[PDB]
Amino acid sequence: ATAPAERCAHPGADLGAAVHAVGQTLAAGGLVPPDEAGTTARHLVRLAVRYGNSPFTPLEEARHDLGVDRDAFRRLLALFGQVPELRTAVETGPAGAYWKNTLLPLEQRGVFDAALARKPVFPYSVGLYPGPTCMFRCHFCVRVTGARYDPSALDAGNAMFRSVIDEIPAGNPSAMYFSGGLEPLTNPGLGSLAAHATDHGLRPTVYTNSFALTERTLERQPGLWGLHAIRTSLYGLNDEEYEQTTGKKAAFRRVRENLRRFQQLRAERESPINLGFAYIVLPGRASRLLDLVDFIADLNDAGQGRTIDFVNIREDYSGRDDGKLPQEERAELQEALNAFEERVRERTPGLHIDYGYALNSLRTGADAELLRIKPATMRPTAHPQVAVQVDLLGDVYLYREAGFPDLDGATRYIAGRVTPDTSLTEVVRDFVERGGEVAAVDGDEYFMDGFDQVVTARLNQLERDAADGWEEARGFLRL
Amino acid sequence: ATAPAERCAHPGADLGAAVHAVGQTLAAGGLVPPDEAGTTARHLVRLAVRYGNSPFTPLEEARHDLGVDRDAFRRLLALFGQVPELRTAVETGPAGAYWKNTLLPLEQRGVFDAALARKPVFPYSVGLYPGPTCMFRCHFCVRVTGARYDPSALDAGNAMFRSVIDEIPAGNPSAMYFSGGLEPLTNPGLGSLAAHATDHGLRPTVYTNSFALTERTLERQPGLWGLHAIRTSLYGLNDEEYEQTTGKKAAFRRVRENLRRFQQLRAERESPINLGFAYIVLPGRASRLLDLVDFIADLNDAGQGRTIDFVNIREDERAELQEALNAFEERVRERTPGLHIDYGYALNSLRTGADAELLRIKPATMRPTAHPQVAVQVDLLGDVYLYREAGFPDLDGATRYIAGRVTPDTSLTEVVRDFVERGGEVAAVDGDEYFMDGFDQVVTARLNQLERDAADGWEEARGFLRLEHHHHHH
Amino acid sequence: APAERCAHPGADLGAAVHAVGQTLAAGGLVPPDEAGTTARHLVRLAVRYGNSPFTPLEEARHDLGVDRDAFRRLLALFGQVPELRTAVETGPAGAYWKNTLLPLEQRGVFDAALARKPVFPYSVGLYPGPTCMFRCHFCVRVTGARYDPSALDAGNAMFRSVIDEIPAGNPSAMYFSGGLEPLTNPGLGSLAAHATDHGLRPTVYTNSFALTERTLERQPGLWGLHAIRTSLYGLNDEEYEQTTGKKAAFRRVRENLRRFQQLRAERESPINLGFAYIVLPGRASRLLDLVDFIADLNDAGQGRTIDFVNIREDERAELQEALNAFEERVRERTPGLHIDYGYALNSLRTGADAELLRIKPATMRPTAHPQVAVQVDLLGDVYLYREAGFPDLDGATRYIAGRVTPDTSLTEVVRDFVERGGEVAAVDGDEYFMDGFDQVVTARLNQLERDAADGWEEARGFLRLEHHHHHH
Amino acid sequence: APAERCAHPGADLGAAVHAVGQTLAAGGLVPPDEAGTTARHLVRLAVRYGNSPFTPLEEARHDLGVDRDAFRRLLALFGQVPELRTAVETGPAGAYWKNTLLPLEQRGVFDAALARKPVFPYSVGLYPGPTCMFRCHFCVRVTGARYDPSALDAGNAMFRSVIDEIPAGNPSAMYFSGGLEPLTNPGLGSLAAHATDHGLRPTVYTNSFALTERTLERQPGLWGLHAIRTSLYGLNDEEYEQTTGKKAAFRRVRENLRRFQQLRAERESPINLGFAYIVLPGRASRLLDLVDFIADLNDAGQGRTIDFVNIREDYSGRDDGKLPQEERAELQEALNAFEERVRERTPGLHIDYGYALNSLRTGADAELLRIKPATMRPTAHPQVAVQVDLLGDVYLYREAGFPDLDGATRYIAGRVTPDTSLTEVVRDFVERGGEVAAVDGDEYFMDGFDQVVTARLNQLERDAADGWEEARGFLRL
Ligand SMILES: C[S@+](CC[C@H](N)C(=O)[O-])C[C@H]1O[C@@H](n2cnc3c(N)ncnc32)[C@H](O)[C@@H]1O
Ligand SMILES: C[S@@+](CC[C@H](N)C(=O)[O-])C[C@H]1O[C@@H](n2cnc3c(N)ncnc32)[C@H](O)[C@@H]1O
Ligand code: MET
Ligand code: MET
Ligand code: SF4
């Protein structure tokens, strides 16, 4: 039971019932004289349909589609702000994951403004890549087989990591995270890094494959119990699936036993740490969502009522065909996702689910694919105000999928190196002040993760709107 | 077609219909065996009514009102978190202005957590008080007649403000605001401070009486145009009303012509700056709200279609006052349809006819550590005041609430960190309670409630309702 | 439950719309974006039929403003929200649905009248009294009119032949009432015993003025009746003379009933005792004195109490709490007394602003409803409406469907009239021939005939049947 | 009101006695000192008859320990506390009172059988199917036994004359069920249309295996029925094969019902559609899946939904149909989740429970009656119910009307022929006092309804023989 105007962006929505409800809101509120309430309510609903599906549409394109004067578009933008049901229709429409998860949270904190003005500010999201190696060979990962960091570089690297954590301003508990190009649990001092950050006032999350998340590892790295959460990347639901995805035999059994035992130890400790999973839906595995619930239910039985906290249903953001789901399987995801939610409430009620940008559109039946930024649409200054990444050697990478050792072309996206004489603040500040740029060549676009590609499309939308004279109204929705 | 479970906190609400809806939500979710769905729903609804009207109620007092034992209260709280219509009843109840405007936003940002834990944190809300002087003498204001800052403080104070602005971390463009004890526009370098803050990535609001917001000031201080908003404290609707409030003659005509001309320049410059007004409704004169709409309508005519953005309405007869705000809203829709309205905490509850329960912190209920993690204020001398109304020169007893002084050798970050880390405290004496503005009293009432709940063994459930940080994982 | 209460005055209609909106959405009955608009139409239907049960479906559709196909969908969706059917059956007009319309629809009583088919009447009134000793100012009986005393035996044999015609399946299909007073027939006890032997359990409706011990000895078969309901025309001698025109009539009636209470307990007779009482405008405080009247009767029956009362009607918040006081004093003084109100009085409780039906000549159905109810007087004349069976009543003979004779049964009187399409064109004043039941049956048949002609043959009457398969 | 629910398990008996005692004292029915002990006796009676409706009055008096003068006053006092009658009728045994006992006393049906008088049967079952294609393990039909196909013409003419005999006043007094499957009679639609023109509203009780589109095409009079109730024997192909013996039986029954849903919505037929569903051993956890089956049929109906579901058990008590004590105890919880699942997904679906199943919700353990040869009435109850098969044979019990069932012929009251009507068959058997001596096995000729009527007529005859003729059956109204 929902209001018509709040659902007016999803497929098959009664646009007439929405224009009527909006028109009454404008008339009753005195915003539009009653004789024109119907006309403008149609323009307003059309704007909400568009940005509820394509959040990056430049304002001039939306005005052209309305076939309307600039002054009358300015009035519609102001009028749009007075109709809260249409804002809801955008934020909760098919493309609503864009608005609620990334666009609006970053806009409100001024992060997009700092990058839009090319001003030297501390990065809003600092990624620390502490892992020297990895024991998986995932077909969708850009890491180069065999490439590793020097084992004799761990001590100086972990000392460098502590100094970077000293720079992280408090007030945002999720400002820093431990992830990687490689696998962070292969760093023996990751628990020490976690302790140094929690002692700093941060609540970081570790993103791992959990192959090394053994009970012996928890004993030698007790600081991991102080993290906010551990998100395990889940690459399959049996050994044959894990071997297809990661190339490693018997990998599923050991990852599962590690989380079964971790669930046991979390109960006995009554630790506030959260446990979640990232589950990329891979080609030929859309029918496996039902079995994913059984995997989580199995993990809940080992936790003595302590539940798995969240699950991130995701997609290969690279777009390469080894990860891209065919349209045939894309068409079956609406039924699959809705049935997956039903089973969760049956067997795993307390588990939080959230979907990728395109997956969230597929439920309710709006076809959508993830962005695929090309070198022509890459911003040569990157966005260090939004995010940077630091690996073991102190190198500060401009995009998430560029921080891999011995990756071709990846060194060109190093803004600098954090040394005992140079801080991350100084590396980012000097790269912004001197206007450092990197020209994009073919293949560079694959250094960008899903977040980097969304941040790029947003900054491109804002620069174009400001260039089109819509400086204040840039991005359609903001404050 | 509203849900009665989302409305049960307002007066005259059908509580019977609320317990039926909640009981069905409990039965449908399998949260209670069907025998106790009635008793559990009446308890849960009683909790929603209580906290929808009295948000600071200690959990133990609510439990004693319910008549249930400690263990039953624990599972009642866990069930409350599974009846979302009841959270809405609290959030949108008569006291909903507390929850949605202050309590829950600050809880989500970890602001109350930091003060509760006595963590050395950079203050969430930093007020800069740059005015050396005021030309008004408002009878309600605590400023001391004959008191002002020396002109010799201007240069070093403005450079001090610049260094403090540089200290403010990224992530909240509203972290800093320009207000005062005294009048901010009397600082000739206020526009430069605004430009310095704008370059920093901040979007600051100035709170002023706008008497000095002349064209001469705008040309002397063009950096004011980059502010996010100017909220003018409107002390009346004609000269005689303005003279009884402020003691100055012909002050309404000056403020009005200033705002008429600003509207004109704002339209010509196409400035995105916002314009708002704070108006206090006096006893028995709630009809003057209609004249307020006419005042803004006249301002909207000077702006060539570019209108006034918001109005803050505060108080300081029940059904009458309810009638008068309803008339105020009707005429807004008729004359100023886009004007945003938000009421004070007590006034927001008097709409709906609920009894405005007064918040009067006394010296006994003041927290000796204050709350520098939430808010501090800096005047021209670099003095960091712990409460908003303590930052006035020569104010009796007010220097006792200086946490420290920002100097070229001591930053604001150090002043706050040292005061918190050493456990600095100020023992309250009679009269200190007037140093707290409305915000200080709500923050103190919340921190007293949180501390009482934790001491009572309800640490996780402290404050009844709370938001957490939203950790989204990509 | 707000959705179950939405038909009552001052109900929270917004809460009902939300509740029914959830049911449609959660059940997949309606897309959630239009669950609110459908819910408002469904609640409006429930409010209408919970207050005006006879509204034709086309009238309800026109007030909703939806087309024919949309109304059909709304009627089907309405059958999916059990709380709304409850709102209709327990609304201000719920007594119509629960006490008359739905039970008769279940038994197929209306269907025979709709199809114009010959069946034996569902309700057969026998009027065996030749005279009456009262002259009630409200009664339509003609002063100076009575039945020939030579009509008795001949008519009593006719009555016995009519009793023999009554089929099995409804032991209360026949009752003894009248135009005039039944107890003035010396053979009424014999007719009662004849019906008891037939397997029937009849009730007699009487003013009980002639319910003397002498009458009991002359007509001992009266003890075999299922129940005796006395028409109570007052609570002291003055009121009874005011109503009936007879002096010291209350003294006689109370004397008879207290005597009957003693005799009933000595015989350990299972016969039930009831009373009909009319509350007069503004005098609803006399309901408390009625409880005193019943209590004194109880004290005369040694632990054998009066079984039921029928309270019916002639600002009204003086009435609303007059009935709460009456209801409470019953629990204090006569806790076993079954209370039943009329249609209007039942709606006046709950504060609803509803009247009784007032059928006019233009809305009377020319065929009448012999399949539902007929009445036979001492001459064998079969009357089509209850208040037409009075000798010499002006215009009443036009509503005689036929006469039961040794050569013509009641079954044949009703069959010939129906099959030949017999009709009576209503003239001004004929509407007084219909009692309250006749007006309800007329109003329901008009509604059912209208709905069927409009193309709503299956939804006719809005509410009709249930699902019974417990004997499989 | 604690007195209105004093018959269910977990009731505050002390509070109910307290409230009944004040009713007794306030109303002046009993002196105030004895108001407490009398209220306990009255509450004990309501608890007893709200759980065991067939208890002889002399057994209840012995349980109370009083004598006949006290019992007589207690019966009279019981009628003066209306909340105690509500506690009986809405107690765990309330399905007996509200569905069968009290409605049939109201119609004088029980009095007709009690007085051994010739009245037309209250319930007339027509058994028109010559064969069946299912082999349900709980049915008493014999594998392979069939009716001669050449008997259909004379049988369908006989059925038409029996329908002509049905009296008005009860439009559902006749039904099409059977021993065998009624849809295997090619003239069932004609018999249906014949009764519809008679003014009846009959129901066909079928396994719906033969409810195909071609069958509706050939038997259009089926669309004029009041309702079709499909006996549901499983929720997938495996469950159906386990129960009926036939493979691919569920998918064909479901397809027939899906297509019937499309046909019902196309012509907007008034016909109702419901289901009978026996809770079989090992399947008490399947009630939630039953709602999924119903919603699937609702999706095929385009807004026109399933009207009702009857939840039943094996009324024979045999091992293969009787639910073990363990699984039966799980039924209280299973029913509650079932009803909450119906309320969410199929809110218009009417639900009703068998006699014992209705007691299991609210936690009262009860079993269906198991009549034995010693408690069988030799005259049976033709005034209450009879059944007629293809050959015109009038069977006295529902489960005796099967071809070539051993000993079933001993319970034929007569044969309807062009010379002899059902009325005369029942009249002659009643007027001559026909009786059938019960031999071991005859009790399995009685269905659930038969056993309830027998137990009621035994209780009524026992009460009268004990001198409680007027108070017979405790409740009667
Ligand atoms: C690869 S690093 C994590 C370090 C650790 N070895 C692991 O796999 O969890 C960051 C995250 O990016 C995800 N990821 C890597 N390549 C991806 C791709 N092409 N599409 C979507 N997610 C990808 C991984 O699943 C992991 O959760
Ligand atoms: C004998 S069948 C004949 C009608 C048709 N063949 C059918 O299955 O519905 C009549 C009804 O009795 C039911 N029945 C047969 N044996 C039963 C038993 N032992 N317990 C409960 N019901 C039974 C069947 O399920 C069916 O609904
Ligand atoms: C708290 S006193 C300062 C108020 C401010 N100077 C004004 O007049 O708006
Ligand atoms: C309907 S005429 C009245 C019949 C009966 N003699 C009475 O007084 O009630
Ligand atoms: S995604 Fe993680 S586990 Fe997989 S190959 Fe890359 S670094 Fe290793």
Ligand code: SF4
């Ligand atoms: S309230 Fe503001 S304007 Fe008034 S005297 Fe105080 S400082 Fe001056």
Ligand code: SF4
């Ligand atoms: S109402 Fe009855 S008692 Fe009165 S005059 Fe008429 S027939 Fe006689």
Ligand code: SF4
């Ligand atoms: S119950 Fe019906 S379908 Fe099953 S075997 Fe018996 S006759 Fe056949």
Ligand code: NA
């Ligand atoms: Na007297």
